[PDB]
Nucleic acid binder design. Sequence first.
DNA 1: AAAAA
DNA 2: TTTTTGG
DNA 3: AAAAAC
Length: 351
Amino acid sequence: AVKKISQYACQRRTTLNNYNQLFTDALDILAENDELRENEGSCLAFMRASSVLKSLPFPITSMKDTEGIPCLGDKVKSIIEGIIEDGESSEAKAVLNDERYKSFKLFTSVFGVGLKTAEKWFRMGFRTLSKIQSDKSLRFTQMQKAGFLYYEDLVSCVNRPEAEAVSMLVKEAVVTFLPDALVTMTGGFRRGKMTGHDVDFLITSPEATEDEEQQLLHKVTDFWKQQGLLLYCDILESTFEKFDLDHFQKCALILKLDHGRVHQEGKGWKAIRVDLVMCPYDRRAFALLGWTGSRQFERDLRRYATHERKMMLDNHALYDRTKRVFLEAESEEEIFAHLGLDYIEPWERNA
DNA sequence: AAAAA
DNA sequence: TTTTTGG
DNA sequence: AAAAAC
Ligand SMILES: Nc1ccn([C@H]2CC[C@@H](COP(=O)(O)OP(=O)(O)OP(=O)(O)O)O2)c(=O)n1
Ligand SMILES: [Mg+2]
Ligand SMILES: [Mg+2]
Ligand code: NA
């Protein structure tokens, strides 16, 4: 007969071939509105419903189709019913016409602007980016200044040839200071995505000392600053503790990507958002798993570990509360096995 | 908002 | 019913 | 020291 679809993204295979985009585009909009209205509960319920539909191997064409699918309560089934009716969501249409929603989308599209700043600007009466940028009283963070200066490039999204060009630059800068270092692209591109808002990398070295591990991101970014390629840089020192804003040493960057490096109407360069993460060699599988994503896959991995296995998972470790021991892993497959989960390939984590 | 405690 | 929802 | 990144 059939198998039961789990409520956990970590127990589903989600590939990029989405047969239910009509439903998930509507659910993504309704979730985003609840995120903006700080209704965390309703937001998460629409995110989970969107996630589960993305895992289906077929399109929903009737309400009978939704039987046995978890994460679809009465409210969500009303939304699906409405889309089956006319091909549109009246609920999502009303959100798209809402002035608070339109302003939040527009303002947060700027690097450096999140929910609090977007809400502040809206309550001040600002509706356009032109009126924000030209205001003489407003004060902008260094992140927002970079967000406005490179807006058109950052708003456009990175493609695979650009991501590969960035990978080459990262690898050649990293091996200059740590020749045995392992550089892995993570993030959407590792999950098989054609585009992304940024390019993320995990860096680890089997030999390097603590001090060498600490200095790598500083050495690599100076090197780029010397070449005039570092457009923005923010290095966060590690808040990870060997024995919970807890993270590995990382940096949020904007790099100048010369067009010649990508395999010229305007300047032969594009501003690219790049994130680098340095982790100790023994925690490389936990970091890789945390940074591969998707965000929904990571949420559910942690939720499943806690509620179903009485385990605690994060980007640095896996702890078993019953056995009172930290579980160690040399690969992602070993983490899945510790959790009692079937291995989900990176391209199947697009939840 | 949905599911579990 | 109240609590949880990654943390 | 809230905020923005994960
Ligand atoms: N809230 C989040 C955000 C991210 N991550 C992990 C999973 C993905 C990874 C990347 O951060 P993003 O770059 O925003 O992820 P993305 O998957 O690469 O999507 P996009 O490529 O379009 O930015 O970090 C996480 O555990 N929790
Ligand atoms: Mg990314
Ligand atoms: Mg990123
Ligand atoms: Na932003």
